[PDB]
């Protein structure tokens, strides 16, 4: 396959025979996908392995495949294997399953859902704050992964199961040490490596009842949500049920649906408020004047609301503006299923059409001064200068985040109480700048350490 | 995987681990459908390695797979693999690339194209008249698949490529050794990509070569078969490789299918005098004084359809029908998941008890216009049915039609010391005696 590229007239690097051009993935996803839109353009074709990858710039034709094409055409994200029977997962899923499980679990994030949630969340935010205060007094430096962690736990184990498993920690919680080796793409591993190389050997470890998700860590899960069945006695568990007592969901994939809830619940919100808080400790001016909105939204360190928190501009400046310097998914990908040519440019079925998210958003055509923090941008003012097609930290289309709007509520409700009470220094062990982890996701070297001042 | 029949609630036989139910396979697939028909019921499940397979006997059931539901969800057959370049072949083909290859090669067998092949085929009868004379005149058994076969291949050869190939043709000789070790593609179904990557086949390199070069000869020229390839070759398309992908296939069922059933034929009519003295009289009164047969005095002929029917009818060919579902579905009140193999039972349909009175037995008169209203078209399925059934059904009638007329008009057979009465089936793979017909051949 590696002439695809070269018959359709698409530059892109030389790929090597069987490896194609995972040899160029040593200094990760992100610095690979921006050396190749500075070389080739606004279009370039690799191949991951044998599998050919073509990566798309256009605003218009990213529109094309993510919301024009999506049910027809663009449908599938790459076939990742092997998965078992996490297969079912909506993440994972394609074509009716997909379309069924997307339908069943939108209306868990719906604006009344989410406005329920508040209360709920406002409780750890308390929890949050103890913990952080008790780390305050002390001159100690503070791991922002494990306190944002154990609280992106509790907010979604109680309000999507209802159960609450870290009663203030609990540091040694069973769920946070599981979800954490729930999944370690690492390219060292010749497993994910293999995998990518030589993708005939899928269908024997399927067989072989292997798993790229470890089977203590899913086993504790499993046995987790059957235990969290507690019925007699409307959330992301109860949707589930009462559609399961009416094809319909069985007790394995109501499990594998919660599985990725958990996840991204616990790995996304805790990685984008370690990221975020990092931009405030180096951005003093950032993070005084994103204090003093929050003060005058709430005064007298008044609680959160749903509406208060929509009405907070600057903080959703912040936000954004993290989300752009760090996309924590990288890339959007959809598999072609079918032969199409999309604004004036032939695509053979089985290519993956991949949209380079973390090169888009540092894209000096589009972004003044990319690696610099500027929230500025997402000013009312300025945010018309920007294409929701450039942007898209959560994707695009009929299957973009889910839980885009419940992150968004959940990140901001953990800034405010934050920042109600504490303000956050470099350690000097602090790295500065942040060095990206060369590996597979988005994620720092070195843990982001920062010093907590009470005010 | 093999707790798919047990979830969905239809019966069958318990499978082992890997293998299912292959082992049951010893007796071949006709005795194991006849069983599992009467064990079970209308509707039973077994598993062919890790592949489920699903056995539909409901003529409701049956008309919704094949036709109704063909082009929506039971398009294509079971995955049949490690192949290669014959992928592209009608029989292999999947979804767009066989409606392409399925609309090309319709054309082929027109009520106008066969009236064209009836003086070609013409030609051919007197030679199996001749040589069938020089084994009658001295008393000597005539081996039936190989003299039917001879003249099955100049036949299939002309009417598609207007080549002559006129005993140990290499065509032949090449054509019949694709008839073991396929025990393992059906418990190693992740084995296919290892052989297809690596660019391995199961047919042999040679066979392939022969006929691959072959056709590359036939191509020199300087609208038959061949020249409804080459036309749609010079305007996605069709290329050198699949052109003779398409050759191996009607060359193989031309030489193959059209001997085995003569030979079948001529068995019945040796073993039933009264219905081979009756049909020699029904030839000689539409063609008086042994005048050629044309394409309207064939059809003309109602008691050679019957005994062509009832013939197809005791051995169907191709044994079994499968469909692969391609996504879920709920037919006739009954949930078939995606992947499932749907299979009619041909064979065990074609001698059930609950339809044919007697049905091992050889009676003619089961498709006279007086009783073949009482058939169903579903349960007597020798050519399939559907937008995919045979494409060469009336090709296929027309020609055995065409060599039982010459042959009956100038020849009687009776059976020998060494005529297998009665005959046996193949317990293997394919249906087939297990030694060949042998009949004495007497001359009128
Ligand atoms: C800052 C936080 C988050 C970010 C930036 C983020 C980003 C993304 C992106 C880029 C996609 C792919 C979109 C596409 O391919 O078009 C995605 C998919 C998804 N996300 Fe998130 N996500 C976050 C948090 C969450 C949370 C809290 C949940 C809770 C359930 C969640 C659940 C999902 C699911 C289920 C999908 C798959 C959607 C589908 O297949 O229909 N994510 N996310
Ligand atoms: C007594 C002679 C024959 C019998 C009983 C027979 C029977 C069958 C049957 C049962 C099928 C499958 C139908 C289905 O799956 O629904 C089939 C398919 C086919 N037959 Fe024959 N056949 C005969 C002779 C021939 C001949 C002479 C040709 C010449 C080209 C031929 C070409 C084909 C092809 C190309 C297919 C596959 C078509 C497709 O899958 O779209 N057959 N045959
Ligand atoms: O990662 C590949 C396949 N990629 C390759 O094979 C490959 C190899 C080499 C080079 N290029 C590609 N698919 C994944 C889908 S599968 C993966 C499996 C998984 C992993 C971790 C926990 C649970 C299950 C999964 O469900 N994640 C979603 C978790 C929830 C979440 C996470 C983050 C944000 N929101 C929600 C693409 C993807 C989809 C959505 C978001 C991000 C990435
Ligand atoms: O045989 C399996 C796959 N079967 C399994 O894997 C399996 C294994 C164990 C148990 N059950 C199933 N498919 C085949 C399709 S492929 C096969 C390959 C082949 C063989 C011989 C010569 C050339 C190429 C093929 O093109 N034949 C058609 C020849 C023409 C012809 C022949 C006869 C009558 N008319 C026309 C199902 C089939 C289709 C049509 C008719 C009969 C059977």
Redesign the interface.
């Known amino acids: 396959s590696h002439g695809l590229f070269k018959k359709l007239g698409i530059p892109g690097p030389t790929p090597l025979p069987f490896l194609g051009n995972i040899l160029s993935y040593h200094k990760g996803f992100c610095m690979f996908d921006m050396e190749c839109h500075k070389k080739y353009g606004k279009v370039w074709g690799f191949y991951d392995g044998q599998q050919p990858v073509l990566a798309i710039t256009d605003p218009d034709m990213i529109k094309t495949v993510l919301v024009k094409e999506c049910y027809s055409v663009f449908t599938n994200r790459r076939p990742f294997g092997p998965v078992g029977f996490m297969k079912s997962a909506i993440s994972i899923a394609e074509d009716?399953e997909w379309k069924r499980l997307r339908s069943l679990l939108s209306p868990t994030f719906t604006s009344g859902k989410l406005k329920e949630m508040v209360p709920i969340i406002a409780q750890y935010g308390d929890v949050l704050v103890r913990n952080l205060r008790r780390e305050a007094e002390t001159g100690k430096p503070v791991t922002l992964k494990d306190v944002f962690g154990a609280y992106s736990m509790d907010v979604i184990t109680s309000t999507s199961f209802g159960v609450n498993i870290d009663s203030l920690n609990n540091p040694q919680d069973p769920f946070v040490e599981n979800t954490k080796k729930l999944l370690r793409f690492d390219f060292l591993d010749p497993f994910f490596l293999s995998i990518t190389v030589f993708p005939?050997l899928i269908?024997?470890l399927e067989?072989l009842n292997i798993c790229v998700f470890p089977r203590e860590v899913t086993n504790f899960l499993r046995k987790s949500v059957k235990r969290m069945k507690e019925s007699r006695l409307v959330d992301f568990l109860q949707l589930m049920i009462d559609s399961q007592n009416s094809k319909a969901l069985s007790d394995l994939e109501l499990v594998a649906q919660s599985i990725i809830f958990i996840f991204a619940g616990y790995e996304t919100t805790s990685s984008v408020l370690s990221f975020i808080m990092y931009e405030l400790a180096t951005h003093p001016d950032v993070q005084q004047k994103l204090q003093e909105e929050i003060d005058a939204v709430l005064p007298n360190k008044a609680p959160p609301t749903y509406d208060t928190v929509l009405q907070m501009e600057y903080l959703d400046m912040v936000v954004n503006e993290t989300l752009r310097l760090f996309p924590i998914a990288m890339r959007l990908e959809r598999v072609c299923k079918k032969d199409v040519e999309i604004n004036g440019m032939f695509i053979p079925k089985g290519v993956v059409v991949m949209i380079p998210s973390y090169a888009l958003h540092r894209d000096p055509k589009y972004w003044t001064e990319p690696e610099k923090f500027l929230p500025e941008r997402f000013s009312a003012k300025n945010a018309d200068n920007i294409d929701p097609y450039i942007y898209t930290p959560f994707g695009s289309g009929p299957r973009n985040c889910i839980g885009m709007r419940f992150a968004l509520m959940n990140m901001k409700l953990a800034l405010i109480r934050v920042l109600q009470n504490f303000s956050f220094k470099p350690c000097k062990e602090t790295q500065i700048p942040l060095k990206l982890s060369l590996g597979g996701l988005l994620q720092p070297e070195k843990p982001v350490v920062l010093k907590v001042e009470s005010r």
Request: hydrophobic share 60%; aromatic share 20%.
């Open positions: 009716e005939f269908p024997i067989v």
